[PDB]
Symmetry: D2
Subunit: 121 residues, 4 copies
């Protein structure tokens, strides 16, 4: 579990094609200046869509591998919690594509992301 | 401080080139688990943020990650990963960075491009 | 001018929203040939720049595509494709746009995110 | 046929490397107008797609652009632009390509990364 544990992530909701994961903005995940590290936000996103893809496939026959991730950083986070909402865009045979939005307490967009997950035999 | 959480070590910095490594330990692994893709990307974003900070007057400007993208190529299970960030474009208001992240065996783990905004303090 | 090359038609505009279409013809196809991924991406970037123009004083500023990314989801063989660009963020120096490109059969062809720099 | 529409010329090919140029004309400009960002990207996607095609049996497989990203660095108002695609990773089911697009003055216009899926015909 341990990066999920390291960042103290909590899965707030899962259903087919939708994953919501939150985490506290603490000093251990901040940049030095310091705001929430952009990379920590991206890691939260990649966690959410990887979990979503795993939930959509037969994990005894297939494995979901993060293939491509991209992200725009929009607003900063200094404290409280941030929440990633991952919604599936495309559930293909060999790839899943996910839209992920990461917000702070004040409902501001911190990071917007798209992730492509490879579905491998 | 994420730099400290992931035990990142700056191996080399010069104008337009930053090399930062970190050990693949449980704290940065996915549950299964290999090195978490998000941790790899965070290492990358740290490297180019540091590079950009090194190119500007940090008493007047702040380097903020604007856009990040990444392809995950191979997995890392142990040893170290090393991010090498080389500047592609040093603009007035934006920097663009190429980042390659390799494991011990010189395998490409993640390749990234990062866009860093240079904003007034 | 490429707008003309691809026969783009603005179907709807309002602040922070653009809907723009184009026909899928041979001139924008791959050899095999499907709708070229690059043509779809060009429709998207067009949507972005137009949208940003509608949001700024174009007598003082110019919207320049800064970063673009895209996932190609389905192929398009014929008919028309329609890009809906909705703004995510209206900043001083950048605008971020979400773009969805669908075909006639209401299939998702391409999804994009665009970052447009606002320059003097 | 887009290649013809854009008047593209294949200047050099070898395994894992493609160079394709095209003129900067009114057919591919923005209204303002410089070279359309979409046109540059289209050139890039053409180059890596050709690169992947040159590495496979195209009577059995087809190279399909899966994910494309690009940073636009400088504008082009005239002359020719040249895209150089070098392969980063040759996997069984995906290829990842680095693409640099330059003008006559040897300036970087667009930098791109392309992920190409290899699908059975
Ligand atoms: C998405 C894609 C990359 C493959 O990944 P995938 O999602 O796991 O493959 P899937 O089988 O699940 O996707 C099915 C759809 O993708 C497309 N597709 C799948 N295999 C294809 C092939 N061998 N040839 C052409 N198109 C194909 C079809 O549009 C298909 O729609 P359908 O399900 O109604 O038949 C690829 O199929 C695709 O859509 N490419 C977009 C077109 C494009 O970029 N053209 C320019 C080439 S540079
Ligand atoms: C969006 C951004 C790239 C600049 O583009 P911009 O749209 O032209 O700038 P804007 O002022 O119009 O954007 C406003 C928001 O961006 C953020 N921002 C803008 N300038 C900033 C600065 N100098 N320092 C910190 N955050 C800033 C703020 O959250 C701001 O929110 P607000 O309007 O409610 O005050 C950048 O400001 C940003 O938000 N980066 C995200 C944080 C990040 O990546 N941190 C990790 C650094 S490696």
């Amino acid at each position: 579990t341990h990066l999920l544990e390291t960042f103290e992530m909590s899965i707030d909701h899962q259903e087919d094609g939708l994953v919501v994961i939150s985490m506290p903005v603490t000093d251990k995940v901040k940049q030095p200046f310091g705001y929430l590290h952009g990379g920590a936000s991206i890691a939260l996103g990649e966690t959410a869509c990887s979990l979503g893809s795993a939930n959509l496939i037969d994990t005894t026959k297939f494995i979901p591998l993060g293939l491509e991730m991209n992200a725009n950083h929009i607003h900063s986070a200094k404290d409280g919690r941030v929440t990633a909402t991952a919604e599936i865009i495309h559930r293909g045979k060999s790839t899943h594509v996910w839209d992920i939005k990461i917000k702070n307490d004040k409902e501001q967009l911190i990071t917007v992301m798209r992730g492509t997950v490879a579905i491998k035999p």
